[PDB]
Design a protein around this nucleic acid. Sequence first.
RNA 1: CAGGCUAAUUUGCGCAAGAGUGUACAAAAUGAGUGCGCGGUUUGGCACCUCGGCUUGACUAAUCCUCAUGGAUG
RNA 2: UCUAUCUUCUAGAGGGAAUUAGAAUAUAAUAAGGAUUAACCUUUGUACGAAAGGAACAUGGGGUACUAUUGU
RNA 3: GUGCUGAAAGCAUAUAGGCACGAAAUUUACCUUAAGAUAUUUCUUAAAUAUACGUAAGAAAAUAUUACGUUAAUAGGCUUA
Lengths: 119, 194, 46, 307
Amino acid sequence: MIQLKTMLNCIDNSGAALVECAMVVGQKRHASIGDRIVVVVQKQRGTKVKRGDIRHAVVVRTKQKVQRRDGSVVRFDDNACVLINKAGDPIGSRINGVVGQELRKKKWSKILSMAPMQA
Amino acid sequence: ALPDHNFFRIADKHTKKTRTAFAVFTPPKSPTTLPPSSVVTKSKAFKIANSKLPPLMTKPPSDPMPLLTQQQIARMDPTGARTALFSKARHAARVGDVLMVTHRRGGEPFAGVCLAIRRSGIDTAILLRNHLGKVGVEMWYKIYNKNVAGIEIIKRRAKRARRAKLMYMRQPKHDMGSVEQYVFAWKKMRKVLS
Amino acid sequence: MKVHSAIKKRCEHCKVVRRKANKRQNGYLYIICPANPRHKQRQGYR
Amino acid sequence: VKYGWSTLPKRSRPTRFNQVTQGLPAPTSGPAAALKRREKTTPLRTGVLAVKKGMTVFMGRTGARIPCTVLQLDRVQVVANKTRAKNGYWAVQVGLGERRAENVGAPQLGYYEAKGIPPKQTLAEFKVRNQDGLLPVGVQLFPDWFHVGQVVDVRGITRGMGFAGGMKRHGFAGQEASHGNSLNHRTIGSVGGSQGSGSRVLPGKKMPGRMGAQQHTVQNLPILMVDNELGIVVVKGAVAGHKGAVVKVQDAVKKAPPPEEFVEATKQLLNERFPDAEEKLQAARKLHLELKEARRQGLIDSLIKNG
RNA sequence: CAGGCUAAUUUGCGCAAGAGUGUACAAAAUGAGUGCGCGGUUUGGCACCUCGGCUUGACUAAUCCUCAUGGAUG
RNA sequence: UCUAUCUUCUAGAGGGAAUUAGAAUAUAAUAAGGAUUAACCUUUGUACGAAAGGAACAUGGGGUACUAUUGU
RNA sequence: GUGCUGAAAGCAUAUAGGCACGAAAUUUACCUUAAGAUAUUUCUUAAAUAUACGUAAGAAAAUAUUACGUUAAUAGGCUUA
Ligand SMILES: [K+]
Ligand SMILES: [Mg+2]
Ligand SMILES: [Mg+2]
Ligand SMILES: [Mg+2]
Ligand SMILES: [Mg+2]
Ligand SMILES: [Mg+2]
Ligand SMILES: [Mg+2]
Ligand SMILES: [Mg+2]
Ligand SMILES: [Mg+2]
Ligand SMILES: [Mg+2]
Ligand SMILES: [Mg+2]
Ligand SMILES: [Mg+2]
Ligand SMILES: [Mg+2]
Ligand SMILES: [Mg+2]
Ligand SMILES: [Mg+2]
Ligand SMILES: [Mg+2]
Ligand SMILES: [Mg+2]
Ligand SMILES: [Zn+2]
């Protein structure tokens, strides 16, 4: 459950390390795995995104428990995302870390193909 | 034709006289189990659920929930191997052990240390924790769901845990970390054995 | 259609008619033209 | 006017004198008109009375996990039928359970006496579309009355909540908690406008009050399991009320009726399981007149000691 | 301050007429300075009469979105 | 600052007059309210168009249960 | 808003007369509450019935509502799972 002012760990090679959620796009309820958000970059890593940039992102794993049809429930130790463009495709080229398997049913194929492991 | 019945009497207490009486009808004392039915339908859209008809006008079991639970468990686990894997016995899987859950229609079994066993009939579940990379991941799994193709014990706990739930393993002090070590050793012992 | 309080013919093919009059409403005065559909006008509001 | 546009007194009965056969227009109001504007939504078959026994999940053989509610049928019988000629609408009166005769009143003891049916615990009417939905009196309805996949509507009484405030009863947001608020954290705030709005609280104003214990219907619930031995009908989703409360199950009104082959197959099973429904009913009716006449004369005690 | 009367004014509108703009062509769009009115939102006159936010509404329709639709050398 | 007397209001009751001797149970006509959003895909890259671009009508998107439908 | 027929008015016209298409508004439908005609081959000649009392509860500020009271599983205890 991501909302305004929530901090997330960006796990793509876009240049961002810590981003703050500014808007939940396409809905009023708090964002979960597979939802689009607008973020503001607060920390970088050392056409990369710099601190203060405003980009769109996709929640790839949350700390709130996410239930599935088969009764299984997944939970991560952090909230993470990957930056995207208004077109919907990723900005980076490689993702380091596990992502939520809920990205499959929300039409995020490109984010999954570059994801090493899914949970 | 007239079904069996008994007479209920209302008496006047100021005169000890019968005010009015009625013939109260009782259900057939001997429950009659009729023969099988001859009604047969030919359609792909519906079926008639007349498999086992009970005796006519008989109170069904008061609490059908425990009876319905054993029907689903016997259906989701015919051999009874999963029900025995998590029973409250010595050979069964205990909290604190390491379990590997194989997924139907999936790859990359999820392995982790068991932190809790919720016994809720057909919704019995186990919580497994692991570290995929540098991120902790906990997972609930309904053992009787068919998406759980298999469950194996790859590493048992030396001493029986002193707690029904081990939620303290979320703390870095008691966090076991990753489990790829026990998974590898388990697979090694498996192929070398056969 | 142009709704005016002063409807006028703008060519020799424009005609004044009263349509949508029935047992419930009085209707409106219309300027109908088969030549130019830009001459279509209505007098009165619903 | 007390109700609606009609000023007619409440003791006048002019209906039979305004007939369509006399060349008059068919009224848009009345029983005949009411039924006509509900013909598409009125179920063809009757329903059943069931007891809510608890919630669970239905596990599929390939991975499905569907929440569901278990409803048990406890000696469901057809007690009476309603006709337009006698009542102004088609309906079947269905019973549930049993009850001690001492707890049943003399008016109801004679009501079941004339039908050959043991005293029931609860009665309820289920409206049918036409005369084809009426069933023989004294036949038992089993879970097989429905088939797996059949969509039904479930009516029950919701859990009572007693006197509820404005937050729980109407979803009012409340007021602030710390920034100076004084004794008004869960209060309803303003109850209306000033003189220019009537100098009164308007009718329909949402205020605290009793909540719950009202009838509630859930529509379009599929049936996942049907077991006659246990007498249960497992429906998907949630149902109003507590465990052990009686609910009404009937075919959905917003869905097409079940196939004609199924409606006839079920009516054909009643005749096989109860081929003597009519012979045993007329026999009970005959006895009622004999006992009714004995009570009138005062010789009922004789008819009791003879057997 | 509010209410009442009034409507000069208004960051409120309508109708009539049509200089003109619209490569052409008044009225697709546009509409100088004006006239005839509605309305009671602003600033005022008279002297009958001595704020914003939160919560919770009700109502109007001169409509930002959603529904049906005429016109549109343009 | 104010412990609500009255009207209005939200709930729940005591009594009552009903075609009328009075009840038990199930109830109709009828009345008062409630529910009331938008977008995407499919159609289809079809009509239109030099191209870019891109509708309308209609069907489906309740199922890892039934059923329906699409693949293998 | 869009038509068919068609005159007054030889034409024209969806103008009169005779037919029709057409919207998140309306009505119905759907849901709740109220209403309480009516129904039962229902009960009652001082009752039927209801209340009180007691054990309660799908009910719950009081009240009310829905059950049960030994021919009884209403509550508590005990026993087993
Ligand atoms: K009688
Ligand atoms: Mg309760
Ligand atoms: Mg709050
Ligand atoms: Mg305080
Ligand atoms: Mg007044
Ligand atoms: Mg003065
Ligand atoms: Mg056009
Ligand atoms: Mg008072
Ligand atoms: Mg007042
Ligand atoms: Mg009604
Ligand atoms: Mg399938
Ligand atoms: Mg028109
Ligand atoms: Mg003509
Ligand atoms: Mg014509
Ligand atoms: Mg309803
Ligand atoms: Mg109390
Ligand atoms: Mg007990
Ligand atoms: Zn013209």
